[model samples]
Target chain A: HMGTLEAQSFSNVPAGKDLPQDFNVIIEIPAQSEPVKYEADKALGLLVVDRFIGTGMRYPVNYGFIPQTLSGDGDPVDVLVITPFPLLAGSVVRARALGMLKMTDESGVDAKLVAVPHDKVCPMTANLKSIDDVPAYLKDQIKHFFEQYKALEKGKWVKVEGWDGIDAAHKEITDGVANFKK
Target chain B: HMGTLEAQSFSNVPAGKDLPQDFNVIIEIPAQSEPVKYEADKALGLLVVDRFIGTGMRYPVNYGFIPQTLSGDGDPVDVLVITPFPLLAGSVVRARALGMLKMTDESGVDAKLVAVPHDKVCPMTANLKSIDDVPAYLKDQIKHFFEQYKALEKGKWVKVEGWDGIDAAHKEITDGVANFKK
Candidate 1:
């Protein structure tokens, strides 16, 4: 682990070399965990510990952020990586945006994009085309997980706005890409 | 997931059909997670979800309570199962008590037993006769995780008493076994 550390920023990493469908995401927390909250410290390129999620819930999908993008809340655009098993924190995965899970909290417009590993890398979801193809139960699980995320704590609220199609997901990404430069 | 539902109690389950060296633990929460608090519903024989641990930390080891045992506070005796990777919730493991992590909370008498899967099942920790063999960092991580478990929330406090050898671990378990019947 020795070298002149290249000056870099995880937040400024290219969203994706592929257009329309494929983009890149850096994992902050693996699936099936809710304890440690990992965040991308974009300015310096370190996976920073945001906090431990006090909610007694497990993330249904791999959670991270799209580099070079920003959500409406001025934070890095959120992404949920759907796959078979848990991924490691701080791992950057090339992903395909399939849909969006619209969420709103006291924080406002806290939406998340749903994606899967790029077809070139993971054949498991290669045939999947859009959110419509994802099972209703899985999507419901995601909806409920966030809805109850902060239920145990006092003076905090989160609501699932609704689910959006691939077109909305792409539009969300497009807006994030533009927001980052704004 | 089908069977004629028979009634039983999780807390009353035999402590150790194998004793002094080996005891049974029902994993309520797996290692590396602090969100969901799993507890055994002794009266109903089900793995109960206590609540989401809103602590901004993770449990360094698999945490649960020994069956048929009770601590001074009248709750089931707490146990931390140390092993490789995370295990499944609601799973019962036969373990060997290697030591104890003595902790006193505002609730009082909140000590926990430190254990590993029985050598007959897990050879990785077979040679470990006591907590002395566990790396200092691991023990430290466990200590800090609890010490800060309630830091984010209001109106709670916990202090780690210290580490105790295998003898104390066994003694803790023995006391719990007797306490349960009392």
Candidate 2:
């Protein structure tokens, strides 16, 4: 008998071996001055031209996905790659999970996770590990982006309750991975 | 007034803006000596250690997924990145669409599209645009692997109906992307 000779019965992947800490990030809307947004077309292997923000606001940092994940809102966990430098859209990078920006639009939990590029020797974030370690300025930037992004529209939504620490981020990702199996 | 100030109602990122030529690929099981297979977890965004090949034959080329597009069977389109060199399991790269190994494993359509790294200037495969441009030896390696892998298990499966050209690959991809919307 062939043990574990299973035909792929499901479509899911683990977050990372070193979870609650590091994983993969697919950059969709790279950090740029423009509100021109691009998003992951999950079914096709491409970052697509989604839409432009009607507001004068733009993505403050690189925005992407924590692949193969679905959360309470039923969307790929919105992951923000925390890097001073901008990355290209549709590119993948190893990212360090810090925590999440627990925002909820009227629809559901608009979860925004915080991550840094898994740089072994970059001094800027070398000592940083969790949301607590991230400077307040950066956190403020993230919080403000969404508030303003949602404020102008009055979609009767947008709530940044607070930042969940690394532990909560871990649990969310784990649950998201598990949810994908269903 | 914000027009289309919509909270992401649909979970879709369009296939590459270029459409049907090039797109991003998340390399799950990189081309290597051993068949320690891995796959994408659509929700959590990591390549997981799925299983090991019981048979001695290994993946001749890099095996991975086409990111978001879903097909009839519901798994990500099986894509083979044709590179002589092995790649890391969880890395991302641009891929040039070539053709597909049209095989059915009792599941009706076990699609395996062929692709190469989308290098701007690479000697060996720079001119290779479609599946026909691929050499016979490379094609055989892909076809044989699936046939033999299923043959050993004898799960009442497998039918290699020859290869489909770039046009067919394009059509399948487009349809898969559309299906993902539903």
Candidate 3:
């Protein structure tokens, strides 16, 4: 039998409230997909995970959710971990939050926190500690990937508000911790 | 059912026999696993495809088996597809055989063909088309993964005989096609 970490317990998952400055990231999809979601008490056996109905585009980086935290958008807080190497699905990585990408959509602010694996030094972001340190080209590339990926799928249009450094990112997550029960 | 490609075949699944110089590679494990095997008329469900009493290791590259051919080692000839991006499991990749890694173990010669996606250019191997074209460091990395992984599980010891160019890889596969029924 395929195993689920817990039944009906996203809030109980290790990452819920008052997240540490550094914590683990639970990767759901590595690259290309409509995106696979994990359900509490859901059968994890040989079931075909969700398939995308719209166009498919590969995720530019490792994408996942922070455990134990819920955001203003009524979903688990989103994370994008950047590294030189590719990580695998169902793998949890120790990461240090560096910043956040402010994204607004039909629902509300669904900002994506930016992080790097704590143990590994990423060539792309190792020297940079804040969003201001990130190169314009790299930032643009990430913005385009998100903007274009949604458009390709005929999904909702996203407005990229801007990038906020570590301090702002922490508060966003801190505020999100309170929304877990809402 | 987890829905293996056989139940609903991918866009390109080969193995009718006598493979072309360039064909699609069917991936079973994208990177890490205990190794997955395909069985004739098997359920392809959540069943552990094949288990090693030994420990599991992450594959250094995308690993899979040729569909319609059986090698001298008594199984479908194995392939290691090298690319910059990590492919998803159960996906088909159009690849061109570049060379073969001649390996000898308790079962005798068990060669792993080296290939690249026919349509996509891998930054790491774009200039590489033959065993000779691959850098010494890259070759060592691939060889080491196979050798050490088996040792870790207390499996058979393998001797990496050498590398052969595209022509040799083609013949090895062609020969396997003739042995598929045996």
Candidate 4:
């Protein structure tokens, strides 16, 4: 309550100002635990991302939502960080887009941004230029996780359409910028 | 070497004689073990499939290679059995095609045939007709497993292009039938 940043207003701060290269990755579900999401209303804060209960499985990598961007699912864009280490929830990391995972869930097309921590030394992703650079098995696991993570709930059916290179990833963010609205 | 059916020639019996509905899934990596592939020469028998060392990661489902069929990887087509239980390394199971996971590896286009044990009741995938029938998270996990399972070896990079329905899956088998030589 003193002189510090408020959690609720973190997303409202100048949307889409520094993107395509810089992104505000709000950690929702860190490497493990049930997934939680930030509420759209600044005052409402964050809540569990899903209406259905989540499976007990833990995430293998840092997962979060990208602020100032809207996806077809009517929520902030989701992002997957390919870092050498893990971070806590609500921890903000500056990242750069490396690729995109095009997916289809029960609702519709819900894509995820694959990025690397900017200005950080991550051997897993440091030299990566595009999705192609990312190892093939790594891409497969991420796609698999999303497709099956919701089985415990509504027998959710998710399909990973494919992936794109950095240029297409940047294009997605640019297109997402246009779709973003308060 | 008696009058019994030798498992070695299971893959060489008859290619595509009864397929599109029934597939000869030659188990290479049984559920929960290091993956090994069959040697190209049917008479020579099965051997380790990896060109490089393995990552030591175990398979979640029964992984196998389709006999007589050739994929872009220059190897026999790979098959993933979504059975409730696991089988032995060289065991051949008659499975029904459920869908396909289109992938791109370091070499070129690679795809995995997702199938369920035919003439058997497996809760995991008994009634699944297409990828859509499978749980979302389960699909994601399978995709995830393949992408990351081989990370420790050769910096293996694999990307899932997308998934195909039953029609496309059957078509792929039909095409593979023509591509199968020796």
Can you list the residue pairs that collide in candidate 1? A52-B56, A54-B54, A56-B35, A56-B52
- What is the C-alpha lDDT profile of model 1 across A1-182, one tens digit per residue? 13577633685579878754778889988987655677877887888877655453458789998888877787878999998888988889999888888888886888899999978788998877888888765776677667765654567789998888899999988888887788
C-alpha displacement of A72 in model 4, angstroms?
Answer: 39
Of the candidates numbered 2 and 3, which has the greater TM-score value?
A: 2
Worst 10 residues of 3 chain A by lDDT: A39-48
DockQ of 1: 0.05
Candidate 3 lDDT for residue A18:
30
Worst 10 residues of 2 chain A by lDDT: A6-15
Off by more than 4 A, model 4: A1-182, B1-11, B34-41, B49-54, B119-124
Number of the predicted model whose TM-score against the real structure is largest:
1
Better of 1 and 3 by lDDT: 1
**TM-score computed on alpha carbons, candidate 4:** 0.47
Residue-wise lDDT of candidate 2 within B21-93, one digit each (tens)? 7765666776765767777777756566776666756888888776667888887666887764454454455
DockQ of each: 0.05, 0.03, 0.03, 0.04
lDDT accuracy of residue B121 in candidate 1 = 89
User: What docking grade does candidate 4 earn?
Assistant: incorrect
Candidate 3 wrongly placed segments (more than 4 Å): A1-143, A146-182, B1-12, B16-18, B32-49, B52-56, B121-124, B152-155
By lDDT, who's the top model here?
1
What overall lDDT goes with each candidate model?
0.79, 0.69, 0.64, 0.68
| Candidate number with the higher lDDT (1 or 2) | 1
Over the stretch A1-182, how does candidate 2's per-residue lDDT look in tens digits?
12476323012334555765667777877786456455655664544333335454778778987777777776777788777778876677777778888887889778888888866734566677888888888789878888777554445557789988888888888887777666
